[PDB]
Structure formats: C-alpha cells, structure tokens
Design a protein around this ligand. Structure first.
Ligand SMILES: Cc1nc(Nc2ncc(C(=O)Nc3c(C)cccc3Cl)s2)cc(N2CCN(CCO)CC2)n1
Ligand SMILES: [Cl-]
Length: 284
C-alpha cells in the first residue's frame, strides 16, 4: 500500500531532527490541518538499510493503537521515500529527564503507558527491540506512545523466535547479545533497563563504551535499582531484569504490579514535566 505524490496531501515544514537513517521534518496534513512528522529517506543512497526500511514500513502499516505513534503512510516521491507519522509535541521521555529527576508517580505513569504499548505489540506477535526512553514520545498534553520501529521484529507460525543482533547495547537483553533464540521477553528486559533510566536518569553501565557492555551484560549478574527508591519500584526492576527470559513477567502481568497500581496517575499530570523541559530548553 505504498502511496505516491505526498506533497498533494502534506505540506513539508522545517527540519526537526535526525540523524542516521534520514532527516525528519515537521509537516501539515492538508486535509485536517493536523501536524505530522515526516522522515525522508533518499534511496539512491540507501542501500543496505533498504531491507530494514521495508520491514519498518510493514510493521508500521500493521499497528493501530493509542500507544503507538499513528502511521499515516509511506509515499514514493521520485528517488525519495516519505514516512509520515503523527507529530507528538511533548518531547521524548529522555528529553523529559534532562532538566532533573522524576518522582515515582511520573515514573510509574510513564511505565504504565509503555506497558500498554508493549501489551499491544506483543499480542500482535511483534517485538519492538529498541525500548528506551529516547523512543518513548509524549504529546504536549502527556499522552505516551512508543516510537521508532526501525528494528521491530515479527513472529509468525513458522518463526516463533528471532535471533537478530539489534537494539541499543545498554538496553539489550542478554539473549539478544548472545544471538540466542528470543521473543517478546527481550522487550521486558529492555523495559527494566528503561525503568532504571527513568529513575536514575541513565541506564546501567552508561559511562562505558557500548562495545564493552556487549561482553559484560551476558556475564554479569543483572542490574538492580540502587538508591533511595520504594521497594515496589526496586521489585518491578528486579522482575524485569531476570537473566532467564521465561522468568520475566509479561507486559500484561506487569500492569498489575504493585509499583504501577500504587503510583501511576493520569497522563495529563505529565504536562508538568513537559512544561519543565520547555522552560529548561529555553534557558539552555
Ligand atoms: C525530533 C522531534 N520529534 C518530535 N515529535 C515526533 N513525533 C513523531 C515522530 C516520529 O514518528 N518520528 C519517526 C518518523 C517520522 C519515521 C520513522 C521513525 C520515527 Cl521515530 S518525531 C518533537 C520534537 N520536539 C518537540 C519538543 N521540543 C521543543 C521543546 O522546547 C524539541 C522538538 N522533536
Ligand atoms: Cl502533540
């Protein structure tokens, strides 16, 4: 369902990011005047990532959830491919960390919405494989959605596990680094690392070279959350960061975890964080 002539339907506005894959622009849906995000990739300079792009578009085209960035479509325009998504204006969860620490209500609220996204994806037999705060985006009023499906994987009846080495090293599950047969439980490990990232501001080993953690993670005991945090938060992290994937809970099970039930509140309260970042960035 590749479409054509994107500028008949969208207005391309200013660059807002990226990067490695391509360049990302703000845009307008001319039909509704809603704002969109447009990733433009020139495919005559592709040339190996082309297979990954095809996979990314496939995954995007099959997702339909409040907890995953809304996909408008992929458009051919001469030599270039336009990947068009809803624009979320609140920043990423990583951005929201920059001015300072979160409290456990904010951490639980964000984790609960990530979990609803993971529950959705995993129920569709999809694996995100790059869960981290940078890939968790917020609307300007605090809605929280998963983004960047650039390395997302799909399980099928004939392929019940993946084994591809993808992800971001600090957040990668040990079985992914080992290139063992793995599934959605890899996302649950990454969620654990993300919980530490939300609590501490950065993942375990964050001051080491990424290549070095590739040997450390499979060997070392799993990270724990250290510091003056509630016991249920520490337990939530511990549950996620089990070396044996089958011992990790599902996303569905974690939604009922004491940490989430006791501390998560309305997403609209996250506007406080969004405002904090806006103030901070304006003074930086
Ligand atoms: C880089 C960036 N994106 C933003 N919102 C997005 N919504 C959806 C996105 C998305 O779907 N991208 C994407 C695409 C399009 C294809 C493949 C894969 C992916 Cl990941 S990106 C907001 C933002 N700003 C807001 C907050 N700041 C001001 C504070 O003062 C800074 C600027 N900056
Ligand atoms: Cl928004």
């Amino acid at each position: 369902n590749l479409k054509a002539d994107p500028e008949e339907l969208f207005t391309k506005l200013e660059k807002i990011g990226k990067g490695s894959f391509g360049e990302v622009f703000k845009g307008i849906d001319n039909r509704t005047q809603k704002v969109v995000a447009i990733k433009i990739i020139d495919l005559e300079e592709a040339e190996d990532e082309i297979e990954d792009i095809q996979q990314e578009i496939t995954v995007l085209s099959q997702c339909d959830s409040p907890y995953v960035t809304k996909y408008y479509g992929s458009y051919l325009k001469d030599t270039k491919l336009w990947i068009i998504m809803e624009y979320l204006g609140g920043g990423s969860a990583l951005d929201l960390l920059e001015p300072g620490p979160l409290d456990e209500t904010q951490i639980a609220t964000i984790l609960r919405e990530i979990l609803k996204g993971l529950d959705y994806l995993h129920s569709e037999k999809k694996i995100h494989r790059d869960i981290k705060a940078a890939n968790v985006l917020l609307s300007e009023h605090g809605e929280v959605k998963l983004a960047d499906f650039g390395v997302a994987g799909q399980l099928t009846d004939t392929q019940i596990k993946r084994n591809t080495f993808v992800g971001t090293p600090f957040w990668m599950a040990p079985e992914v680094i080992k290139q063992s047969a793995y599934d959605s439980k890899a996302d649950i490990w990454s969620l654990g690392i993300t919980a530490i990232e939300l609590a501490r501001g950065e993942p375990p080993h964050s001051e080491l070279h990424p290549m070095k953690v590739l040997f450390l993670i499979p060997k070392n005991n799993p990270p724990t959350l250290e510091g003056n945090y509630s016991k249920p938060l520490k337990e939530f992290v511990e549950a996620c960061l089990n070396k044996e994937p089958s011992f990790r809970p599902t996303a569905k099970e974690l939604l009922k975890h004491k940490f989430i039930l006791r501390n998560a509140k309305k997403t609209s309260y996250l506007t406080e964080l969004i405002d904090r970042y806006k103030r901070w960035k304006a003074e930086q």
